[PDB]
Design an enzyme around this catalytic site. Structure first.
Site, short mmCIF file in Angstrom:
data_model
loop_
_atom_site.label_atom_id
_atom_site.label_comp_id
_atom_site.label_asym_id
_atom_site.label_seq_id
_atom_site.Cartn_x
_atom_site.Cartn_y
_atom_site.Cartn_z
CE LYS A 186 -2.03 5.17 1.92
NZ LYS A 186 -2.24 4.72 0.51
CG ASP B 164 -5.15 0.92 3.55
OD1 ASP B 164 -6.39 1.03 3.60
OD2 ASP B 164 -4.40 1.86 3.20
CG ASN C 42 -1.91 1.20 1.16
OD1 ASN C 42 -3.01 1.08 0.62
ND2 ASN C 42 -1.50 2.33 1.70
#
Ligand SMILES: O=C(O)[C@@](O)(C[C@@H](O)[C@@H](O)[C@H](O)[C@H](O)COP(=O)(O)O)OP(=O)(O)O
Ligand SMILES: O=P(O)(O)OC[C@@H](O)[C@@H](O)[C@H](O)CO
Ligand SMILES: O=P(O)(O)OC[C@@H](O)[C@@H](O)[C@H](O)CO
Ligand SMILES: O=P(O)(O)OC[C@@H](O)[C@@H](O)[C@H](O)CO
Lengths: 262, 262, 262, 262
Positions: D44, D231, D9
């Site tokens: 992120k 995540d 991720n």
């Protein structure tokens, strides 16, 4: 005092801003127990279609907003879309608004908080009311002192929004709560390449909001609603504002004694 | 004349109906501008678990209700689950209540309508506001004259309900509207074996209900909610019923100056 | 083996039942690996409009179903609406179907369970996957040995259903799972006083269902769907059943290797 | 040529990327009929908490991705969050990803299309499948020639997403479609100040996606999912990718003939 955020959705022209500002000023003179904040977007950065109206630029917008502020002595609020806009906008905006789709963009929030101005975040259509505590946490960390959370509806199936009024007392635990009366009855991307709206429900839901208990109402208006270059299906005719404000104050006065503490 | 439908959820025992019925009676004496109606189910025909309280039978129910009625002079209402219960229940019930899940069962409605009594259909958690038009059309066809539609929330994801207040003015186009303040905050199967609820939102949403505009409210009460054989997390403390009634009368008196016209 | 419940939605005439019953019988011989079952309702007990087709009565109903059962030797299935239709209907129907709206009506379940037949419960549009556990627990308590749970969509906003495929592997934990290919793509109350739908999504979702893993497919068909007297917009032409059935077997052949073991 | 977009991720370190890249490279050699694209975000930007991991900066991320491309000869994709990031990212990215919450920000879409690189827009959790047409139209206006639309779930109540597989056939009318197997089972704000997920449903829903028909799948992986900096509850164990890819190709081989013509 109760907050009333109002203005035309978009800065179509400064002639428009001035005409609406004139009415808002009159209303501020009539309703001394209300804090009025003039709102208008210098840019519609999230339109569904590339063919729709966006605006005349940040600078033109800040200029038009400053003109309203100086000519009528009204407080200002407008939304930003990328971090660099915070600083130039803070020059005129008393309250920096954060768009619903962008309510989780850390840098946009930190940038608004850094200006020292008040910040009002529209709650995302995808966000649960309890998830807003973290949003307030970012703004505080960033230095914000006057923080607002605005209810503007939640995703209910496709092209429709529902207002979960339970969100008002939940969010009041961490911030002042604003009820967005115009966008909560908006039907997202409902008119093909544009969004729709159901004006007939605007007033009743506002009554609901003040009955439940909130710190302010956000409502867009326009001298000729059907002609608005953005959100046409939702703007309230200028002449209807007085009546709705009166109802708000009258309902708040009899219901405030029942507002739950904390 | 505002309608207030209240009472214990299920007919747990004679002493329950009587203890609540006398409180209801006392209130009906203090608030003469209100039309009270005593509510209580003789059977919970749709619990989640096969191990949950259902009732003491239809016979013991129609009997227990007749007691409250003849002893306190209070009108009566209770729900039916199958066609045959229409005639036998109508002997005591002034208003025949149709369960939310059954709002589409043609025959059940048709049977309730023929009895000549008043019919109150709870809107199904799966039904859209404008779909109630066909529900009213059936009842009229069956000869019903006094028809009510009750708002009790809509399916919003799993184990949760939301109240779309836009439904009040929508359903008012073809019938009188009642707002269920207790089940609207209920969490379907929130506890796996049984349903849950959030009592903290009952009052705030009641306030929104009357500010918006409805012909009456539906409230389930109990001396000690905690010990309720069903809907325990949603039952209102019998001693709070007075403060709530007075609150909505005050809010209604002011908000009614703004209810739209259908 | 794999279950495939097909047939006309409503018993419009034994002529229809037999005609379709003919094609099903044919496919039943060509796909000896599949377990076919004839389906059709003798009465649409929950239509939206009081003016819509319902059928020709339980009598004429059970009648035509037998005519198809004795002439074609196909198993039969039909849905009951009130507790008193179980025993009588259990005469011809191999599997008793419980309508979605009535999936929590205790007595209706216990009634179908006592007849000794197999019971197939349509999962309510308002019900969460994990809540079907109690639904099975009621059937087991009532004497049911062969229990089915049918996925038929979940309320997604107004007049729309969404299929949450996570339900298949969740419900499989306590009952045989069937996927309803026709009503999963229907639009409840989508045509005003009549339901709508889009058959363009029926096949695709069927593939999804078998790929995920289910015990059978439920799909209604008709010679000329456009002239159907009920659920017309969701009826599959009769000539497409064979192809779809072949597709299902091939996909299940390749995917079954991966179905998660419970 | 089916597209498999995979990778960790976030860019936790250049070391983690080479570890996952070595495996993606192995898979690209074993499955030559598949086109692999290595994915990892350098930031992120929409974490729920101000305390959660974001990343090591754009410069470091672009360097990390370029090392993977050079060492393993793999295509690269990463997401951007503000317009200024498009160009520097385009130096290494073969496909520029647009975050879900940002799918309607005109300037970000235009910045990405202007780089001349392909663009993959994650469909917002508030967007209806048909609303994506305008998205594609904006991208073409900006000059994009290779465009992707990614299904990543839709807001279903609070803290929950559901996949409406009807979207695949719908979006395929305007662009190539990717199914995000990882985020479609993510539970928004589910863990309080973080998000949760149901990894158990990942494989089942991927099978569904290829069964229905899509142009590629998006899967995040990690050597130690539990330790992923973001995540985590949704990252697939690196060693499980192969089995899943094999299943995809197998299901696609059989299902492909049934794919309806757009
Ligand atoms: O297998 C069935 O017959 C049925 O799908 C029931 C279904 O046929 C009816 O609910 C029908 O779709 C409904 O009556 C249509 O309503 P209209 O709005 O009048 O078209 O079982 P369910 O309980 O899952 O709906
Ligand atoms: O282009 P459309 O679909 O009308 O989008 C409307 C939005 O830009 C508008 O609601 C905006 O978010 C608020 O002013
Ligand atoms: O079994 P639970 O899930 O508690 O609900 C039982 C229902 O009969 C009850 O909610 C009823 O609908 C309301 O009074
Ligand atoms: O754990 P949280 O901070 O809620 O992050 C949720 C993620 O979906 C978000 O960071 C982003 O979409 C990651 O891919």
């Amino acid at each position: 005092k109760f907050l009333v955020i109002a203005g035309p959705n978009a800065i179509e022209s400064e002639e428009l801003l001035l005409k609406v500002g004139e009415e808002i000023k009159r209303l501020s003179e009539k309703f001394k127990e209300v804090e009025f904040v003039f709102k208008s977007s210098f840019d519609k950065a999230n339109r569904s279609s590339i063919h729709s109206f966006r605006g005349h630029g940040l600078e033109y917008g800040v200029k038009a907003l400053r003109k309203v502020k100086e000519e009528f002595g009204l407080k200002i609020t407008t939304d930003i879309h990328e971090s660099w806009q915070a600083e130039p906008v803070a020059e005129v905006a008393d309250i920096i608004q954060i768009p619903a789709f962008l309510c989780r963009q850390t840098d946009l929030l930190l940038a608004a908080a850094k200006t020292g101005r008040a910040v009002n975040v529209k709650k995302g259509q995808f966000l649960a009311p309890w998830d807003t505590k973290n949003v307030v946490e970012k703004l505080k960390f960033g230095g914000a002192k006057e923080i607002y959370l605005t209810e503007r509806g939640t995703t209910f199936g496709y092209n429709n929004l529902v207002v979960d009024f339970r969100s008002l007392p939940i969010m009041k635990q961490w911030a002042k709560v604003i009820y967005d009366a115009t966008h909560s009855v908006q039907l997202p991307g409902g008119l093909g390449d544009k969004s729709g709206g159901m004006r007939e429900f605007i007033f009743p839901l506002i009554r609901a909001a003040v009955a439940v208990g909130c710190d302010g109402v956000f409502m867009e208006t326009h001298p000729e609603p059907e002609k608005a270059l953005s959100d046409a299906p939702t703007a309230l005719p200028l002449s209807q504002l007085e009546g709705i404000i009166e109802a708000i104050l009258e309902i708040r006065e009899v219901a405030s004694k029942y507002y739950e503490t904390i």
